[PDB]
Design a protein around this ligand. Sequence first.
Ligand code: RBV
Ligand code: RBV
Length: 1580
Amino acid sequence: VFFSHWTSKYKERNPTEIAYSEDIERIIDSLVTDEITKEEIIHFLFGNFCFHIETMNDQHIADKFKGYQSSCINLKIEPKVDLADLKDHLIQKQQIWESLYGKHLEKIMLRIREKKKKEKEIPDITTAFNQNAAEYEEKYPNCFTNDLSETKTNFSMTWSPSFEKINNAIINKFRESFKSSSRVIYNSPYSTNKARDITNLVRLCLTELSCLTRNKNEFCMKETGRENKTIYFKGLAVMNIHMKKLIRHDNEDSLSWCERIKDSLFVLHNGDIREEGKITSVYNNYAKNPECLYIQDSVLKTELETCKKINKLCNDLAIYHYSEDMMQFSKGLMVADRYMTKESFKILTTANTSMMLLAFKSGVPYIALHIVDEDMSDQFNICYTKEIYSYFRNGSNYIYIMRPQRLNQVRLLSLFKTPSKVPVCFAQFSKKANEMEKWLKNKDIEKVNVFSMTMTVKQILINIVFSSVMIGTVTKLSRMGIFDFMRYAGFLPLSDYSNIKEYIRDKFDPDITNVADIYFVNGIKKLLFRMEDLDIIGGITDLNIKCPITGSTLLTLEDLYNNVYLAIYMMPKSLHNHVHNLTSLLNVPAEWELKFRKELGFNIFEDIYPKKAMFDDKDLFSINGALNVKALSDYYLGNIENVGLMRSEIENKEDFLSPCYKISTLKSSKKCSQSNIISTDEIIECLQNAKIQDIENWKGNNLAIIKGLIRTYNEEKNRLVEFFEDNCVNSLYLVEKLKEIINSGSITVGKSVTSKFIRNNHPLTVETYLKTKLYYRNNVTVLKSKKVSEELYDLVKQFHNMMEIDLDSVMNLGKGTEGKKHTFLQMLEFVMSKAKNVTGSVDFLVSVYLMSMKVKMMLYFIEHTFKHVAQSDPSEAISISGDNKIRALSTLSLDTITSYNDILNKNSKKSRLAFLSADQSKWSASDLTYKYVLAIILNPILTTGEASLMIECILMYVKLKKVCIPTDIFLNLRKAQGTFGQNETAIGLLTKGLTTNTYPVSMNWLQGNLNYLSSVYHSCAMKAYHKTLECYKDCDFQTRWIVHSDDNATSLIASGEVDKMLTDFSSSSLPEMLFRSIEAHFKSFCITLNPKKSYASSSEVEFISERIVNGAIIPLYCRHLANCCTESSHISYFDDLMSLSIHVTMLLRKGCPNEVIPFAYGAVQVQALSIYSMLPGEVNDSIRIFKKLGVSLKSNEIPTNMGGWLTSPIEPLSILGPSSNDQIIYYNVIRDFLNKKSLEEVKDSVSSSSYLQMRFRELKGKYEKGTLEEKDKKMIFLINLFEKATMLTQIIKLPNFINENALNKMSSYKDFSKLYPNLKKNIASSLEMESVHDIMIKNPETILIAPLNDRDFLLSQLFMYTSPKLALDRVLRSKARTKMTYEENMEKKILEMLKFDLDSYCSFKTCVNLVIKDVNFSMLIPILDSAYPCESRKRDNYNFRWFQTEKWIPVVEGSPGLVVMHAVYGSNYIENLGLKNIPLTDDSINVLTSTFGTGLIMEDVKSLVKGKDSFETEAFSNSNECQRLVKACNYMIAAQNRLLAINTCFTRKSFPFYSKFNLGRGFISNTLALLSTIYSKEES
Ligand SMILES: NC(=O)c1ncn([C@@H]2O[C@H](CO)[C@@H](O)[C@H]2O)n1
Ligand SMILES: NC(=O)c1ncn([C@@H]2O[C@H](CO)[C@@H](O)[C@H]2O)n1
């Protein structure tokens, strides 16, 4: 049945003694035990398919039986002759193999009892902390100094004073203040050459060196006095352009000092007088009157007043101005990172009235200068007691100079993210603080101020301000370590943790190097003290305290997790260096591979070797062997049901037996990282044909090769000598030629310039430098990065024997559908036959992970043949239908487990329940890979030959894998070992003294390569754990498991003799024994549990995120909240706004509070405007340009691609998405122009014909009479916008770097430059161009259709070429000429769109149709129009109970089928706006090639000269609007031919080829019920 097709030609091959390697023999020979012998394991493993015999075709059965008989012939075991002997032997095997699980149960019990009596029993957490300090003092002697005057800087490297006086005037004020007599007073850190030197340096730089100026602020010194030069050089010597000092965790003077620091911070912050700015404008637009963001404003008022009060407190406490100053000064420092030298400096001054900094040439060293009045000076001294060198008195003011500080680039970027980080932290902390919220509810907006707060509310505001300041501008690594510790140390309120005290004793790093992190340390210590002191309302009985913000009297448990994980997730990632980060990413496989090699006893030099017969139930790297086979056999028998139907479904859906370019994974523009090296023959021929008479005439690659060999000879002569010896016979001739070239003297040599040699030179120089430097009788390769769409083209050319491209060779074969094609598996076996030949094993090379095309195809085969095996398991959740399925399957697991326990607890003896939420420690490095070949062999889906191919792929992948080091990292490591170390770590042990580029890694299969097979093996291990647990005699067990890669969510319900079973398992609780038994079983199955980020509980489940307790979920919206303010795509403004509006929509879907949404809007808009299109008050705005030109559009009607602001209403944003604002403004303008009231009215008017023509004619008459109106001008502007333009596009697209200078790197362009000569590389051009279009117009399928077969792919790639760290770059690109400017480009563009123009009926009516015809819009808008505000079981509660009722629950009773009021939503992809742009582009390129053909055959094309029929029909199509006429024709024509490529050409030329060949037209969409996955906890 189902026509089982042989999808290979390896039918004669067998898994044993036919493949290249013999490792299967020793794999079988390593599985012999004392009771299972050689013939039994051979019989079971090579004939276990007999259980899958009632759903197999006869050809499949005969092929597998022949494979069994053959494999037993090579494996010297006499096989059985008929199937009956096979079945009898298999029932004997199933009995004796069944007698193993009691032995495994006794083994895991003995392992638990062995692991019990070894670890520790520590009394409490205070003793654990004291012990951890004791071992840290034992490792490093005499730390934890008691003198606080030698710690590090406290207030980061930025110190902002509020200012009272109202850009060169500030610098002149400082210059006139600095001219008084010297009365300086030096300061002690916690109660002096450096202060004197920095005072003299600042005094000189202010008085005498300021007025050779550049860019109005940057100036240097050359013609100065010798005394001034001495002062400047002493200042630069102070600049400098284990010795750690720590403090103990239980200090008290540090607490008192930190309290004084907090009060002085608050009284310093409450002094500002400014009231206008850039950040203030956008945040006040979004939060001062946020009622424009709602539709039903009157039903909630206290939330809006609370948001207004929070914004008023932000305005009062100078939060916006502090964030603005931080952003502008970080931008100025990033600009100051420039080619300016060490003798120049810059004066940074923002709109702050009297704050200055001096920036000099690891980071940027700088000094800050401040003016402080006599009112608040001692509080300034208390604040900055660590960071004040000098101060003096002038008039009624004090002048303060701070210490030099250094900033890195990513640190300046994190300072640049301050206006997005800080105000949302303040808003959510003030929202979550209970007594602050009740005080804000008590007071009215006219009366809130600091002076009328009580002591407690004042203190909690001080703590909130301090926490927000120290969280939003985090720079140093101590806070990173503290927040990582608090991330990993929140597991104490639960039953069993195994990291409550051992984690603190072992892995906690007490790296407290300064003050005011002790506040966070004592906060988390007090929380853990309360937790150890001993739906669910939390804090009403425990009376818990928040860690950062203290925040007493917590209402629910939902706030603690949200605030703590907000502090966790709002931290920057790469505060470590880029080179060090790549070293860390490349170095961990070296450690975890050499550990494996040294433990198993392999040495460095020898081969990988498959089996040392030590893979029998050991601890480090082993499996049980004879148990995994039985577990996989039972898993396959219980999972796979219909082999033939499943195989046919694989071949149909996953597209086996299809051409390779039809695979979407192997077609899209990714990178394959092939190896390409400049040829040694090319190098020696360049050296041979280099002419000494042409020393000045050398240009290009010859000059690059000459400079490379000159540098190689200058650095290392002997290696070049032996390279010439082994690569040329005339080595003396080459040496004397090189000597004559270096004695000519017309070339330039260089010294060791580190990374600059690769930075400012041609790549060929450094490639020939590396190749001539590292010749060690091998071929060192550096991987390039080619596209996969250009390797597939070369592979097809190689497969079809077209090594060199000919124009007639492609055209000979491939006429229509019946031409020559190929399939993916014949391609794959041709690839394997090519790769099995000796080629130096360059095919298997991984560079940081970029795997080759060959390996990509092989893991595509493995992963997509195991994907459908993974799809049939209901307890397995990697094959999900989106992110909804994970949460849905998790909550079905939890509620069915709770239901089964509630059933079981009635009338039973005893019953216990325990959950486990585990993450595995190292899923890739510590794992074994030879356990996977076993899972390949008993696969019943495959036949003989495909399983052998799979085994060949896995064995070659394991045995031949290597990892190559990048060039700059390799050179830096080499020079570091050469000049400092003369030795290296394990990365320099795998590589022979760093004399090799590649180091081998085999048993660590790389992350993400094998995702489905590993999860399948994890689920098999879980089922084997259940089968082991079932063998206990006195108790009844039930286990349920959820499996994702590197994850596990288990639960177990036990009944029976509970006290006896816990005494046997040697633990006091069911979570404790569950943790120990899962650890023992996973250790038996070569899976290493992580003992710190894993816990066993009785009520809480955490799969990947959003932990759920007792059937009720904690929402966890802080991930989206930190994502919106931290992470952005950084490609353009429109795309970043759309991509973060997706995150705003998701945050609205996850149930956030009301007060955070306007601040989130402000955060995304501040980020987008601050990077790309400058926030208002300066150049490159859009509202300023629209106001200057007098454009008819308003401030809130500008589209986002034109620079407009996101002003979508919240419910359409949540339901539709980021395109809803463009759709809404378009629909509003249509309704305003057509003088209609409703969507139904305008649809009924448009649907009747002879209407829009009449409107266009009367609008033309109005334009002729000059009686245009405001709505008419808006209509003309948007009509032109759609004509010259998700619905819309970027319009102004700034071109990237011109890669036409690198198009010679691409093989399709190289083939296009050969069969067509250099006339068309960049009268012969006319006739060649004419030949190109008549061979293009004879084949419309090539340029209209994605490739049906061959002669539709490679010549399409030829013919498509016819006719025409990163944050600093695009913060400077806008302020540059790329030529003209962006602002004048927008000026010229809008001046072009402002005119009426003619022949715009096509764009007008297509805009009208595309806006009106959308089904989701046409159903959503009347529901939003006619929704009653409250009551009738809709609005009852107020605690975030309108972000859940009026959003989406009426939306789902709307689009329909449901009844919920409160649920967390995971939405479908119902809205699609791309059902017309694809045929628009297809018919656009159709008219493009038609117009170019007719313009080539003659000029002035208005009507043709009656050529052929296709030319006549394309003339008729281009006479009118071609797209509009073909849409109007297909409105009633309904041909829909069968696409045989012969009858379509028979029927009619133009219209069938360019209407139906897109497989459809604009048809009606489909609407779903939004897929409410799971409830929230209901409130009423
Ligand atoms: N004139 C130069 O070549 C120059 N100027 C500055 N540096 C760098 O300054 C550091 C030494 O002070 C090294 O990193 C150099 O590369 N080099
Ligand atoms: N980026 C991450 O979130 C990450 N990185 C590593 N790990 C896990 O944490 C362990 C080390 O603590 C590793 O073995 C991984 O399982 N998690």
